């Protein structure tokens, strides 16, 4: 199941998400919430296999029928794509 | 070695390339010329592995230290990227 | 939404899946079922972006937390990888 | 241009490579030798774009007709593939 940090729980309380004891996770906009770290590890993994830019990954994810709300998705995605060495090497050309 | 079609040979003579009997290929600007068909099969293979845009593949090839002159490169490259189903599916976003 | 063929419905009835008239799709193992053709074009898209082998795509999908049941996934997946030209070119070496 | 370390020069002499003072680089099997570190950063870049296994990258490079001889290619290549996070994540499933 999901593991929420103090910072996650903090972000979630700010969003106004609610913890669901029955289903063993937090819920927001009607979806189970993906923790910040889980989201990072997932998006980082997906970028390594495709090296799609920020705009392409974002737009694809919104069409994905994802059952999850990804905490700090955009911020995490922007950080992943802008610090990718291989992509930096590509546009260096 | 390379296999040149009548149309390749046509393009090459117009370019002023020369056949090198010792090396079994045509030479131009100090570089062996890659036939139109070999160029297509190579660039298409490389795109399938990366799905880099026209601009990205072009800029990279210019930095590649490739020992070969690629016959009809841009034309072949633009066609490959503009007819890619996967890239079209990506940009559908 | 999903379009189910005669062949989908026969496979689904054979599985013992059940149709949800209210929610306008078939359900199996607690999941809405993705038709055979929709599954193919999706899995085909994912291979073009990664060119992962049969075994690797299978294992990854089983870990995917997919909200959909993919009809004839394994059979379709094998068809995709074994007819992929780019991968055929890769192992040709 | 190329920078050769003492370790490169040592490895090269063992290979029976030859230094060309006039063109100020080493030559081996009729090809200019790319230093160990340049070879690493190039091969690492290519793996990030493809994540091909050791055996496939190797077989492909042998068919590539690269204009450079890559110092310690196989050893460097195996190191690249066995320390890749994305590939490690893939078989983890
Ligand atoms: Zn990248
Ligand atoms: Zn493409
Ligand atoms: Zn493939
Ligand atoms: Zn890898």
Curated annotation (Swiss-Prot), chains A, B, C, D:
A zinc finger (HHCC-type) spans 47-87. It comes from the Viruses. Signal peptide: none annotated. Homodimer. Interacts with host BRD3 (via NET domain). Catalyzes viral DNA integration into the host chromosome, by performing a series of DNA cutting and joining reactions. This enzyme activity takes place after virion entry into a cell and reverse transcription of the RNA genome in dsDNA. The first step in the integration process is 3' processing. This step requires a complex comprising the viral genome, matrix protein and integrase. This complex is called the pre-integration complex (PIC). The integrase protein removes 2 nucleotides from each 3' end of the viral DNA, leaving recessed CA OH's at the 3' ends. This is Integrase. It comes from Moloney murine leukemia virus (isolate Shinnick) (MoMLV). The gene is gag-pol.
């Amino acid at each position: 199941h999901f593991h929420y940090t103090v910072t996650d729980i903090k972000d979630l309380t700010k969003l106004g998400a609610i913890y669901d004891k029955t289903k063993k996770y937090w819920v927001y906009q009607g979806k189970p919430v993906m923790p910040d770290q889980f989201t990072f590890e997932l998006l980082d993994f997906l970028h390594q296999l495709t090296h799609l830019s920020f705009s392409k990954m974002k737009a694809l994810l919104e069409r994905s029928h994802s059952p999850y709300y990804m905490l700090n998705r955009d911020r995490t995605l922007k950080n992943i794509t802008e610090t990718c060495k291989a992509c930096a090497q590509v546009n260096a050309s």
